[PDB]
Amino acid sequence: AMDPEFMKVGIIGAMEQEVALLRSQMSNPTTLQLGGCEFYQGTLAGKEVILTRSGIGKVAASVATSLLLEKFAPDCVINTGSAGGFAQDLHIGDVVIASEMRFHDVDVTAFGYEMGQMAQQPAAFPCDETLIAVAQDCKVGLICTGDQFMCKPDAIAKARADFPQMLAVEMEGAAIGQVCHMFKVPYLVVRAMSDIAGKEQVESFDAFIEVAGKHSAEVIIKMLGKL
Amino acid sequence: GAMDPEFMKVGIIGAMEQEVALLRSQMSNPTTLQLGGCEFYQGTLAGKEVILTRSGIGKVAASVATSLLLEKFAPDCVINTGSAGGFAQDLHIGDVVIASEMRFHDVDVTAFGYEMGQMAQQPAAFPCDETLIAVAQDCKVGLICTGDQFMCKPDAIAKARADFPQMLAVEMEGAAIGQVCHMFKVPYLVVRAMSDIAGKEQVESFDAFIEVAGKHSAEVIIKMLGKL
Numbered sequence: 266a267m268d269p270e271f272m273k274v275g276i277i278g279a280m281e282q283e284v285a286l287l288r289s290q291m292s293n294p295t296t297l298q299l300g301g302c303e304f305y306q307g308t309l310a311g312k313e314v315i316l317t318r319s320g321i322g323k324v325a326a327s328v329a330t331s332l333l334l335e336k337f338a339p340d341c342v343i344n345t346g347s348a349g350g351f352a353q354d355l356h357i358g359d360v361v362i363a364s365e366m367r368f369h370d371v372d373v374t375a376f377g378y379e380m381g382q383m384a385q386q387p388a389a390f391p392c393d394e395t396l397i398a399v400a401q402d403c404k405v406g407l408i409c410t411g412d413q414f415m416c417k418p419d420a421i422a423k424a425r426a427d428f429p430q431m432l433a434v435e436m437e438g439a440a441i442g443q444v445c446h447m448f449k450v451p452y453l454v455v456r457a458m459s460d461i462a463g464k465e466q467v468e469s470f471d472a473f474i475e476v477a478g479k480h481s482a483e484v485i486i487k488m489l490g491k492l
Numbered sequence: 493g494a495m496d497p498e499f500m501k502v503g504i505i506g507a508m509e510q511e512v513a514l515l516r517s518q519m520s521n522p523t524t525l526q527l528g529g530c531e532f533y534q535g536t537l538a539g540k541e542v543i544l545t546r547s548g549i550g551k552v553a554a555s556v557a558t559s560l561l562l563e564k565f566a567p568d569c570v571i572n573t574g575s576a577g578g579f580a581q582d583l584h585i586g587d588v589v590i591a592s593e594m595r596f597h598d599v600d601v602t603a604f605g606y607e608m609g610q611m612a613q614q615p616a617a618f619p620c621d622e623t624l625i626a627v628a629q630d631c632k633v634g635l636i637c638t639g640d641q642f643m644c645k646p647d648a649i650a651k652a653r654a655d656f657p658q659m660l661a662v663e664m665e666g667a668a669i670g671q672v673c674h675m676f677k678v679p680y681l682v683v684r685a686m687s688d689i690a691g692k693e694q695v696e697s698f699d700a701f702i703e704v705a706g707k708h709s710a711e712v713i714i715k716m717l718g719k720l
């Protein structure tokens with residue numbers, strides 16, 4: 266047709282809680298174990314998908330995404346899961362759609378790069394604008410990524426001062442974005458909040474990870490019907 | 493030695509041109525593969541079958557490069573070469589450090605009871621292969637830490653020193669390479685040479701001595717290849 270179509274869809278979640286619902290909706294998925302990650306291929310809500318369980322953190326997400334792209338060559342990558350909320354009117358359970366991802370813990374500013382900009386990379390990784398529109402159809406703005414669980418006052422304050430427009434944080438989104446940039450593949454990050462900055466985040470996370478992961482995944486399921 | 497395991501196909505990774513140029517020039521008619529924003533050079537080097545890898549800078553690029561290296565070329569080990577910043581007392585520009593183990597200095601999930609530097613679902617440290625370490629020694633030994641920051645401000649250096657009193661040097665890819673090798677279960681080693689020293693005009697130092705650092709590290713690797 267002449268429609269913006271993504272025929273093979275990659276989906277990636279860090280933890281079992283972020284991928285279990287998706288996997289359970291798949292028609293007789295095939296499972297591959299590779300590089301410490303898991304890949305499940307099959308059909309889901311009508312679409313051809315590769316669902317990936319990456320593990321937590323930038324390194325794990327990067328090997329997951331790079332294996333996904335090299336071995337399966339999807340047409341786009343959608344990352345789903347939970348995040349920590351920073352924007353004022355954000356609550357537990359709220360969804361944020363990323364317009365772009367940045368790293369909040371990257372600092373090579375001694376060499377002229379922007380805060381959060383890794384050498385040889387762009388400062389930010391914009392999400393595909395079609396994927397954003399589809400997600401909206403089913404808050405939009407900046408999410409930042411770092412290899413730390415944000416819950417101490419000073420760390421939260423530094424991150425707010427560095428990125429005043431940051432809406433939420435997590436531990437994989439910008440890595441996935443970077444790898445997709447390195448491979449030139451469209452992507453999107455969708456997160457639901459499992460905790461809010463300054464508000465008992467450890468206990469919150471443990472209590473809300475399951476339902477936040479489901480909530481995010483349900484947006485993705487809705488998306489798959491319109492793609 | 494006779495009792496040591498063998499490594500028939502050797503993977504070598506450097507972040508920057510300055511860290512792989514010399515090694516590449518000593519390869520015999522290398523094939524080149526461009527993929528995922530990385531480059532792979534396949535051929536013979538100092539008598540060994542090798543895949544030399546130019547990864548790009550930082551944890552994410554190193555991770556991509558190492559994933560692809562391993563899944564596409566399946567080498568029997570991985571050796572990381574390049575520059576680092578010195579922390580230990582008696583390090584000077586150009587000095588070589590062999591990693592006995594890698595840790596991340598910027599990873600912090602301690603709120604969940606993990607050690608400082610330990611990523612969730614990962615060990616706290618990634619020990620380098622017992623055979624490779626000894627081969628490098630035959631050609632300081634200790635902890636090198638990795639983070640996605642160029643380390644040169646006083647507060648940053650002091651904190652890293654506080655979290656890791658045993659850290660000899662810092663750089664930006666080694667423990668990522670180690671984690672990926674751990675995930676694939678493949679032997680690895682990190683060798684680095686100092687391009688700058690903590691607190692001493694590090695931006696200028698790095699700019700001036702990245703090439704000599706890349707060189708000294710690469711020379712060790714060439715010698716290692718001679719003994720594998």
Ligand SMILES: Nc1ncnc2[nH]cnc12
Nearest residue numbers: 347348349414415435436
């Ligand atoms: N507070 C937080 N920091 C980092 N990653 C998170 N994922 C969910 N909540 C998070």
Ligand SMILES: Nc1ncnc2[nH]cnc12
Nearest residue numbers: 575576577642643663664
């Ligand atoms: N000071 C430094 N910090 C991080 N990586 C480095 N590589 C070389 N020097 C470095």
